[PDB]
Structures are given as C-alpha cells and as structure tokens.
Amino acid sequence: TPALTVYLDREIALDIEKAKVIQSSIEYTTLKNVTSATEIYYDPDPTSTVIEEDFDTVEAYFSQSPWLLRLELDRARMLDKQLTMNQVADKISEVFSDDLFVMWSEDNADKLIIRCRVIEEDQMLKRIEAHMLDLIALRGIPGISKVYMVKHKVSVPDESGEYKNEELWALETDGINLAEVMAVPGVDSSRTYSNSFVEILSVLGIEATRSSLYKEILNVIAFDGSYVNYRHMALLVDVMTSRGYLMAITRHGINRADTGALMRCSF
Amino acid sequence: ELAILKEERTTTPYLTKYERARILGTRALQISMNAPVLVDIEGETDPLQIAMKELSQRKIPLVIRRYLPDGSYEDWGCDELIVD
Amino acid sequence: LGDVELQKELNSEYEQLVSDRKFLREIVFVNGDHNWPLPVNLRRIIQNAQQIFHLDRAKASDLTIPEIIHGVRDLCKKLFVLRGENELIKEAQQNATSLFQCLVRARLATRRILEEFRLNRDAFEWVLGTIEAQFQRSLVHPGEMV
Amino acid sequence: EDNNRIISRLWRSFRTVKEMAADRGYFISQEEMDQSLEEFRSKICDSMGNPQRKLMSFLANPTPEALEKYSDLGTLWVEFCDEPSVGIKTMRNFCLRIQEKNFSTGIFIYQNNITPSANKMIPTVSPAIIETFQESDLVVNITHHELVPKHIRLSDGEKSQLLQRYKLKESQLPRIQREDPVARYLGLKRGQVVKIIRRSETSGRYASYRICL
Amino acid sequence: LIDTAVKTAETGYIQRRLVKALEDIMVHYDGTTRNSLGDIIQFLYGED
C-alpha cells in the first residue's frame, strides 16, 4: 500500500477549485483511460473514406499505403479530465512525429474518432495500436495511479498567540514518485511525505529516512491505542540506520554486519 | 596508562544499582565464609543483611574498577561513592 | 515599588521565559501539544512542600525576588547529566537538559511562586534540594542492556 | 506553454545550485540568490526564449570565514552541459578547461544522462575534484524540507577534538554513504565528519555526528 | 480462533528476530550507546 501525503501551498490549501486543478495535473491519466474502442479499418482511399461513421467528419476535415488505424474515445472520461480531444491528437502526433497522419472529429461528433494512417503490415498495425494503448501518457507524473482530495485539520497559533484549528485541503495519493511530485509547481516541496522510506533514503538523505521510519513505527503501534515510550522506537530506528543504509532485520542484513562470527552464527 | 588519575575522574559519582548488587553479593559471600567483619553486629545472622548494614555505613573495602568503552579504566573506592 | 535593579532582573527573567516559549513553540512542538513525558513531578514536589510547612493562609512571604531568580538560575546549571569540562561536554550537557530546564523555568516563575504557592524561604530551599536529588536519581544506569 | 515551464524549471535549478554553492562556503552576491524569474529570463533566455546554458555557467570563490575555517576550500566552477548526453569528448574538453583554469573544484550539470565510459575517467582529474548532477535532481533543494535537519561540515581540528572527546576510532562513528543526496549537496568526501542538530521530543535539541565514506 | 493461532507464531518470530538484533546494545559509562564492537548508535541514550 504505497501512498503519498501531498501538502499544498498556503493559499491553495484553503482553495478547493485550485486543488481540483492540481489534482487533474498530477493524475497520471493515459489514453487507454479515455480511449473507449479500437478498430483497424482498411480504408482503401488515402484521400477519402468508405466508413460512414466519420464520412461527413473526414470530408469536412479535408478542406502511401492505404492502411488506416481507427479508434474511439470516451467523451465522458475525457470531459472528466477536462482535456479536449485536440490535446490528445497532438500528443499522439508529436510522439511519433507523423508516422500516422492524425485526424480528429468534432466536439459534437457522436464518436470522438482519431484516424491514423500508416504512410507484412496487418500485424504491424495491431502491434502499433497495442503500443499506443500502453506507452502514451496524456498527463500526470508516472507511477501515480490515483489522487485523493483530503481535508486536513491542523493546529496553528493565532494573532493573539492562541492556537486555533484550521481546516485545510491536502492531497493523498497512491503509488510513489517522490522526486517528481515534490517538484510540481503549486505544491509545498518542503513538506511532501511518502510512506515508503526507501524512497526517503534515495531522495531526502539518511536522517529524513530515520525520522520517517520512526513516524511509521509510531503510527503502527499507536493505532490500536497502545503507547510505547519514545526512547525505545528511537533506539530501534537508530540501530536500523546506523551504518548509513537501511539494514533490514533479517538474516541477510544482520549477518552481513561485521560483528563476531560466533554472534552471527547463533542467529 | 589505562588508569585515570583521581583528579580527572569523570564518571557519575553515584552508585549504580548493578554495582550495588555486585558489591552486596561479594561482601556477603566473603563474610559468609569466615572473613573479618568491619562493623559491629547486634542480632542479625544472615550474611547478606550484614552486607547491607555494612554498606549503609560506608565501611566496605572494595574498589570498583569501571572499564570505559575504549579499554581505559578508572577506579573508585566504595567509601567515596554516593549511595542513594 | 518603584525599583529598577529588581526591574532589570525581572525583565531578564521574563526575557528568558519569552525566549523559551518562542524556542519550544517554533522548534520542538510545532503542533502546540504541551503534554510530554519528563522526569521529576513538579506539582507533587510543590504540594509536598506546601503540606510539610503548612503554607496555607495568606501569610506574607519572606522570600526576596533576587533570591528566587538566583536560585532558579543556579539550579539550571546544576542538573548534571555529563560530568566533564570539555567544551563539547558542556555543550552536550546544555543541549540535553534544555527541555527540562525550560519546564523548570516555566513552573518556578516569580509570580507563580509568590502568589499561587507562597513558599517561605525554607520551603523554596527544600524544593530546590528535592528537585536536584530526584533528577539525579532519574538517570539511566551504566550497563543497562537497553 | 511548455517553454514557460521549462524556463521555470531551469531557473529553479539555477537558484538551487546557487544556494548549494553558498552553503558550501563560497560567496555569492545578495542580488544573485534573489534573482527573480524574469530578470533571469532576460539574462539567459534568447529572443526565441530557448535556454542558454553556456551563458549561465559562472565562477565562485570561498568566503574569508569559510576560507580560514576550511583551508582546502579552493576556487569553484559551475558549468551547464549543452549536450543532452555527456560523452568522452565532452568530459575531456571540460577537464582540459578545468585544468588550464586551475580550479580546485568543478560542478557539471547535464540534462538526460551520461555515458558510463565517460564517467569512468571522472576520478582521473586529480588533484582537481569534479562532481556531476542532473538538472531534475536540483529542481528542489532538499535541505529545505522539514524532515532533513541542518548538516554542518567540520574542520579537521573539530574532528580530532571530537574523537578525543569520545576516545573513538575513525570507523566507530555512524556512517553516511558518500552518494547520500545531502552528502553530494555538501560535496562530502572520505574521512569527513558532519554535525547534525536534530529536533528532539525528550530533550528538544540533539546534536548528532556522522562520518562519511 | 484461526486468527489467534496464526498470529501468535508470527509475533513470536518477530520477537525473536528483534531480540537477536538488539541483544548487545549496552549503555556505557560515558553515556554513549554502543554495540559489541564499540560502534556508537546514540551519543546519549534517548537523548536524555
């Protein structure tokens, strides 16, 4: 269960619509999410079409190997991600230059259809289609499956020095990509937190990993309502990260230490 | 070389519980096997009771040798350690 | 009334308290939680002092303010954790008891002592002695297989 | 558009590296660090707004305080690679420029990646020291994050005094990997010792040392 | 019942691993916290 705790900037954290905008930006949405159906139509004429589904569309749009690739896009999800089909058609074009001529229907079009024309071929076309369905990224940081809109409560000193709770908005997500999300504009890069401490070691050095590991252990233990004196968790985490790298508690890490042979053999 | 001179002795002056137990055990063992008694006894027959009575008066001829992690060591006389 | 040396001493004390408040509230406990495990009850020690010397009634104290401030400050410098004269040793010693010293100052403030507790001279001195002894008794023991 | 964000990222990286150099002990003019986005744009962005990496490579020198604190703090040179990938020729010309310039330290910044063959000769530019960073890595200064406390490198005298204080050996201290993000940020090396003052919930302030490798 | 039966064994195993990890840490006279080799883990046990 990887997850991130994305804290927004001061003025955004108190705004909902900017938060939705940032969510949309971060969300790693791919064409397959918005894509609905795919069909390989051999359109014999590179100049016109024998398909009545986009016949009027292609004819209005107009003003090599005849192989054509045809696909259907779901209006509902695309509007849900508030991205127009022109952006998708562009991204498709600029990912393979113009290997397949790209055409797009209209907003009113009953089918948001893109025509891709290759300029043995049958299997090549389906391979390229399967590659489109996977490798093309419309938006968002890779690795983030979904983003949640969470409201946080935080204590804060007041003008009189008194402490007042303060409802704040924040984003908690799934999947892990720390270096990227931390760099996204409009996100506090000093408070982003991840629940996978190896990432912390990779990115935020060693001490950050130490504190995060303590936080994880404390969160686990205190969950049921139990409470354990701090010094114990401190000693444990410090032992784990004494040698500058995560020393897991198993035979591998422990025996890889340089203690006496007798001590390690007994384990 | 390994010993530390009396003037710069830095360890805690108090007597740790573990030192307390070791000293009591050693003294009681000694007394209980025909050793001199440095303090008067009224009616107490148990060697270990005698040991705590002796300690309470600070009359024990034992020097604790504390080993520092490096290997160097300092020595304290049981007469000079503050017992709670 | 209308003194100045008392005023400067007490301004120094108040400045120390303000510095402590800012330090804690900014560095240590950002969320503001003010309940944390620490050695030596102070409430219990103070109320033991009160009971022992029968500090009831509204009897006027005979405890000069400079006595109070000097005693508190001196106590802050006697809570030994490491016994050595190395610069590093002194710095570490100061770092270690920082929070506890902050608490001690927060409690043994002049207004509080002279109004809410109303200790005499003997009671205050005995309180200082007990605080010292209890703290020195609340340290980890060398050799503990922690 | 994409140009706008690209320029923003490049400027953020520039500020990151400037603060990095400053903290390492070198001086930089006050006007430099606070250099705003648009003045930087005018200074570097061309008519077509494309980045000018050559136009932003600059030189720095130690401050007198650091200089007397760390006698090894020699001149420092930063340079941004124009090539998306770094090869043998690229490092060769860079090393020649460093050597003829007699720069004690050099920092190289690239865009995509470096070929391992070129990376092999990096440690053969002695006695000069060369370090490399990826632009993405410098988009956000790590040392500004909450969880990371403040690391302070130590003089040799301080380290000797510390070992004397704890009567330690060099190896007995806690170790930090040489490629630990903070360690690279500080330009650590072998045998150097940092000092960390950490927020503590039982004392308030805990001072911890770590030796590098 | 099944839950208790399974959980007990895994918790016992974790206990054994932990103990065999931290069985040599000892608070030395200097106030440091060092394992068998003398390597220092904390400069002051619990920082207090």
Coordinates of N, CA and C in Angstrom, one line a residue, chain E:
Chain E
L1 N -10.6 -18.0 16.1 CA -9.7 -18.9 16.6 C -8.5 -19.1 15.7
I2 N -8.8 -19.3 14.4 CA -7.7 -19.4 13.4 C -6.8 -18.2 13.4
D3 N -7.4 -17.0 13.6 CA -6.6 -15.8 13.6 C -5.6 -15.8 14.7
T4 N -6.1 -16.1 15.9 CA -5.2 -16.2 17.1 C -4.1 -17.2 16.8
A5 N -4.4 -18.4 16.3 CA -3.5 -19.4 16.2 C -2.4 -19.0 15.2
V6 N -2.7 -18.3 14.1 CA -1.7 -17.9 13.2 C -0.9 -16.7 13.7
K7 N -1.6 -15.8 14.4 CA -0.9 -14.6 14.8 C 0.2 -14.8 15.8
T8 N -0.1 -15.8 16.7 CA 0.9 -16.0 17.8 C 2.2 -16.4 17.2
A9 N 2.3 -17.3 16.3 CA 3.6 -17.7 15.8 C 4.4 -16.6 15.1
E10 N 3.7 -15.8 14.2 CA 4.4 -14.8 13.6 C 4.9 -13.7 14.5
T11 N 4.1 -13.4 15.5 CA 4.6 -12.4 16.5 C 5.8 -12.9 17.3
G12 N 5.7 -14.2 17.6 CA 6.9 -14.8 18.3 C 8.1 -14.7 17.4
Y13 N 8.0 -15.0 16.1 CA 9.1 -14.9 15.2 C 9.7 -13.5 15.2
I14 N 8.8 -12.5 15.1 CA 9.3 -11.1 15.0 C 10.0 -10.8 16.3
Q15 N 9.5 -11.3 17.5 CA 10.1 -11.0 18.7 C 11.5 -11.6 18.7
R16 N 11.7 -12.8 18.2 CA 13.0 -13.5 18.2 C 13.9 -12.7 17.4
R17 N 13.5 -12.3 16.2 CA 14.4 -11.5 15.3 C 14.8 -10.2 15.9
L18 N 13.9 -9.5 16.5 CA 14.2 -8.2 17.2 C 15.2 -8.4 18.3
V19 N 15.0 -9.4 19.1 CA 15.9 -9.6 20.3 C 17.3 -10.0 19.7
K20 N 17.3 -10.9 18.8 CA 18.6 -11.2 18.2 C 19.3 -10.1 17.4
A21 N 18.5 -9.0 17.2 CA 19.1 -7.9 16.6 C 19.8 -6.9 17.6
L22 N 19.1 -6.7 18.7 CA 19.5 -5.6 19.6 C 19.9 -6.2 21.0
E23 N 20.5 -7.4 21.0 CA 20.8 -8.0 22.3 C 22.1 -7.6 22.9
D24 N 22.9 -6.8 22.1 CA 24.3 -6.4 22.6 C 24.4 -4.9 22.9
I25 N 23.4 -4.2 22.6 CA 23.5 -2.7 22.9 C 23.5 -2.5 24.4
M26 N 24.5 -1.7 24.8 CA 24.7 -1.5 26.2 C 25.1 -0.1 26.5
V27 N 24.4 0.5 27.5 CA 24.7 1.9 27.8 C 26.0 2.0 28.6
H28 N 27.0 2.6 28.0 CA 28.3 2.6 28.6 C 28.4 3.8 29.5
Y29 N 29.5 3.8 30.3 CA 29.7 4.8 31.4 C 29.7 6.2 30.8
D30 N 30.2 6.4 29.6 CA 30.4 7.7 29.0 C 29.0 8.3 28.7
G31 N 27.9 7.5 28.7 CA 26.6 8.0 28.3 C 26.3 7.7 26.8
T32 N 27.3 7.0 26.1 CA 27.0 6.6 24.8 C 26.3 5.3 24.8
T33 N 25.9 4.9 23.6 CA 25.1 3.6 23.4 C 25.8 2.8 22.3
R34 N 26.6 1.8 22.6 CA 27.4 1.1 21.7 C 27.1 -0.4 21.7
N35 N 27.2 -1.0 20.5 CA 27.0 -2.5 20.4 C 28.4 -3.1 20.7
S36 N 28.5 -4.4 20.4 CA 29.7 -5.1 20.9 C 31.0 -4.5 20.4
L37 N 31.0 -4.1 19.1 CA 32.2 -3.7 18.5 C 32.7 -2.3 19.1
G38 N 31.8 -1.7 19.9 CA 32.1 -0.3 20.3 C 31.5 0.7 19.4
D39 N 31.0 0.4 18.2 CA 30.3 1.3 17.4 C 29.2 2.1 18.2
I40 N 29.1 3.4 17.9 CA 28.2 4.2 18.7 C 26.9 4.3 17.9
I41 N 25.8 4.1 18.6 CA 24.5 4.2 18.0 C 23.8 5.5 18.3
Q42 N 23.8 5.9 19.6 CA 23.3 7.2 20.1 C 24.3 7.7 21.0
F43 N 24.6 9.0 20.9 CA 25.5 9.7 21.8 C 25.0 9.9 23.2
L44 N 23.6 9.8 23.4 CA 23.1 9.8 24.7 C 21.8 9.0 24.6
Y45 N 21.7 8.0 25.5 CA 20.5 7.1 25.4 C 19.2 7.9 25.5
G46 N 18.4 7.8 24.4 CA 17.2 8.5 24.3 C 17.4 10.0 24.3
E47 N 18.6 10.5 24.1 CA 18.9 11.9 24.0 C 18.6 12.6 25.3
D48 N 18.4 11.9 26.4 CA 18.2 12.5 27.7 C 18.9 11.7 28.9

